[PDB]
Subunit: 198 residues, 3 copies
């Protein structure tokens, strides 16, 4: 019944799960507070190496701290996009280090004025991950695109079958946990994002 | 006989047409003045929501205000690239918000020194829409690439058949006109381009 | 027996060849000094228009002046990636203007702390050529990807057969040498990289 579930694997992956499936995990203060507390806990636990972020049920996070605070963590966040990824849900996914998506999962850059203007929000991350052209197209049209188009556009690293989504996100996450030390991951995130988050 | 034609649809799309087909709409002072006046008119008319830009005949704009002034408009410009898009014609296309191209249409980043050095010109927009690598390749080689390669490289949103070019550009344009308010479009353009145009 | 071989074609291409095949051309002070001296020589010779960079044997440069000094040359460098491109070898390839790769050639962004933190190194060039997402994935995973994936990701202009690698890199290089004047190439490199190398 908690808004956000928290689970740690033996391999040192914190699994963070949006748990309001009845509303396709639409953003809200319960979901926010669960998310922050869950992230803080993974971030503070030296036994945790990598974070996996996902939504329970049919949707990832469909509509409704700075927007990009995930980019300033010492630890990587892997989004496993199980279904509808819309509005603030797209913004949060794109703030993550790496994204896997289930085949058929729907994306839409649909926003109210407040999301469009928000500093370090979608109008910041989207063109940085893709380009002005992609960002203009997706924002002005508000159109729906699927996991496969998202991958073509570079919004997603890899599309897998729905059944294989979590095994793959977890495989990859323990893979990087073995390959990089904790201070190497922190260095990488800080080096890649750079001066740009400040 | 006007250098640039102007037409407004019932749906609030201003269609701006380069009308010097005999010279494949090669840039010139007549074409410039028509273009500025036509853009100003669409921009000033509160009945106009979106602008569509195209060339009459076999070519879009093949060879020969700041270069990027289209990026600072309150309203989106959709380029419908019907044929040869070269030199300053490529620069103008790339300054537009969204590009559709006819199958087979030729592109070339061929420039004199003046176009290469021009501030906020092709050496600004090209790598921003693609990358240093793409920009270096296209500029140093001056090579010809077709609509399909342009799409792969992210220079074009979508390739359609020549017959379907204008219907598609207009469909998309009235689509965004319904989806976004005028102040939402203005906000989007300002948020996406950001500090970078100043 | 020289660490780096130097050869000039009639067409004004300087061919620079890493010549420590026994260790897959792994970076080292011999290789560095040969490379700098060879580049300086091409750069100073007004008969030289374009530089081609390659590795003798099975590998390009597999593991181990500022990192990006190639980007500040007046003349283009075309990398012909014949085989394993890893660590500092990936950084050097990516500093080049244009990259061709042999089919099957292995790439890996595998680095010690010193390479990850290095200023204007891989954590600078990689996301600029691709994106934060690609850079985060490749750096945090340290994974191996082949020429074909590298091309999809925009790290490579074109994959050719191993037999056709040098003929193609040289064709392209003499092609650009005919198309651009020397001062036009210098202008292009300076315009594309811009304020960013300073
Ligand atoms: Cl490491
Ligand atoms: Cl809106
Ligand atoms: Cl030229
Ligand atoms: K350590
Ligand atoms: K309004
Ligand atoms: K000259």
């Amino acid at each position: 019944q908690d808004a956000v579930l928290y689970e740690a694997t033996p391999g040192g992956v914190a699994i963070i799960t949006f748990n309001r499936a009845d509303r396709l995990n639409a953003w809200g203060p319960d979901l926010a507070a669960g998310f922050y507390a869950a992230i803080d806990r993974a971030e503070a636990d030296p036994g945790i190496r990598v974070i996996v972020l996902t939504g329970r049920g049919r949707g990832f996070c469909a509509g409704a701290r700075p927007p990009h605070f995930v980019t300033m963590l010492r630890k990587p966040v892997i989004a496993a996009i199980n279904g509808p990824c819309v509005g603030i849900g797209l913004t949060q996914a794109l703030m993550c280090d790496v994204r896997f998506a289930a085949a058929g999962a729907k994306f839409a850059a649909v926003f109210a004025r407040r999301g469009l203007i928000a500093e370090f929000g979608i109008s910041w991350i989207l063109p940085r991950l893709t380009s002005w052209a992609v960002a203009l197209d997706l924002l002005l049209s508000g159109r729906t695109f699927l996991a496969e188009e998202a991958a073509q556009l570079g919004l997603v690293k890899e599309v897998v079958t729905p059944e294989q989504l979590m095994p793959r996100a977890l495989e990859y996450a323990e893979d990087i946990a073995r390959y990089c030390s904790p201070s190497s991951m922190a260095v990488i995130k800080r080096q890649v994002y750079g001066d740009a988050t400040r």
